[PDB]
Design an enzyme around this catalytic site. Structure first.
Site, mmCIF file in Angstrom:
data_model
loop_
_atom_site.group_PDB
_atom_site.id
_atom_site.type_symbol
_atom_site.label_atom_id
_atom_site.label_comp_id
_atom_site.label_asym_id
_atom_site.label_seq_id
_atom_site.Cartn_x
_atom_site.Cartn_y
_atom_site.Cartn_z
ATOM 1 N N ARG A 6 7.269 11.081 -11.585
ATOM 2 C CA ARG A 6 6.293 10.675 -12.589
ATOM 3 C C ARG A 6 4.919 10.588 -11.939
ATOM 4 O O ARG A 6 4.707 9.775 -11.037
ATOM 5 C CB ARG A 6 6.693 9.323 -13.197
ATOM 6 N N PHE A 47 -3.887 6.927 -12.561
ATOM 7 C CA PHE A 47 -3.054 5.735 -12.656
ATOM 8 C C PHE A 47 -2.176 5.633 -11.403
ATOM 9 O O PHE A 47 -2.438 4.792 -10.536
ATOM 10 C CB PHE A 47 -2.211 5.774 -13.942
ATOM 11 N N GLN A 67 4.682 8.012 -8.907
ATOM 12 C CA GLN A 67 5.901 7.228 -8.743
ATOM 13 C C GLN A 67 7.028 8.101 -8.216
ATOM 14 O O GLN A 67 7.226 9.229 -8.677
ATOM 15 C CB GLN A 67 6.347 6.575 -10.050
ATOM 16 N N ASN A 87 10.013 -1.678 -10.842
ATOM 17 C CA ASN A 87 11.151 -2.524 -11.180
ATOM 18 C C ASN A 87 11.395 -2.435 -12.680
ATOM 19 O O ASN A 87 10.662 -1.765 -13.414
ATOM 20 C CB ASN A 87 10.939 -3.979 -10.713
ATOM 21 N N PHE A 117 5.501 3.032 -6.316
ATOM 22 C CA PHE A 117 4.422 3.895 -6.767
ATOM 23 C C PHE A 117 3.207 3.747 -5.871
ATOM 24 O O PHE A 117 2.925 2.663 -5.356
ATOM 25 C CB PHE A 117 4.041 3.631 -8.232
ATOM 26 N N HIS A 130 4.640 -6.791 -9.928
ATOM 27 C CA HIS A 130 5.132 -5.810 -8.970
ATOM 28 C C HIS A 130 4.733 -6.256 -7.572
ATOM 29 O O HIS A 130 3.622 -6.754 -7.371
ATOM 30 C CB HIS A 130 4.543 -4.420 -9.260
ATOM 31 N N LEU A 164 -0.953 -5.322 -13.045
ATOM 32 C CA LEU A 164 0.359 -5.389 -12.425
ATOM 33 C C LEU A 164 0.488 -6.556 -11.455
ATOM 34 O O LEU A 164 1.598 -6.832 -11.005
ATOM 35 C CB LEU A 164 0.652 -4.073 -11.695
#
Length: 164
Positions: free
Chosen positions: A54, A59, A62, A101, A112, A125, A121
């Protein structure tokens, strides 16, 4: 004293370049050690040969699903999941390495690389490392991503291990 881990990135089998990560073993020792051991493969499994499934430009990138290659799999060296260690470090900008997660205390092997500041986040995370060399290679990977995260070519970790 903090370990340095490298990935060699390939695009449809063609070498792209090398990224190296500082891991913050002083702040998050359990989380850092999971990533380190998965990068050397010393436990018999790990990241070598796995893909970035991904990539969303602007952004994050991942990866880390080395069992189902699509975001549903992976496992840690401690078992299927392990706890959120702490949230000392914050998502302060590009180059941050953070755990993916599925809710509280479900870390596995997916992670990521942030390519933007992602402050929403924070506290959800666990941040555990940062790009040391090769941010330009991360920027190059980011261009093979898309708005929905699908990659236009296969981005793989062709080799990985520990430098320091």
């Amino acid at each position: 004293v903090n370990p340095t881990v490298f990935f060699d990135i390939a695009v449809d089998g063609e070498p792209l370049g090398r990224v190296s990560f500082e891991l913050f073993a002083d702040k998050v020792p359990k989380t850092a050690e999971n990533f380190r051991a998965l990068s050397t493969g010393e436990k018999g499994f790990g990241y070598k040969g796995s893909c970035f499934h991904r990539i969303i430009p602007g952004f994050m990138c991942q990866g880390g699903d080395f069992t189902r290659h699509n975001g549903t799999g992976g496992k840690s060296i401690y078992g299927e999941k392990f706890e959120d260690e702490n949230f000392i470090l914050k998502h302060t900008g590009p180059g941050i390495l953070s755990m993916a997660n599925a809710g509280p205390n479900t870390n596995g092997s997916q992670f990521f690389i942030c390519t933007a500041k992602t402050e929403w986040l924070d506290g959800k995370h666990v941040v555990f490392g940062k790009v040391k060399e090769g941010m330009n290679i991360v920027e190059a990977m980011e261009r093979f991503g898309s708005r929905n995260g699908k990659t236009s070519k296969k981005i793989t970790i062709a080799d990985c291990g520990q430098l320091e």
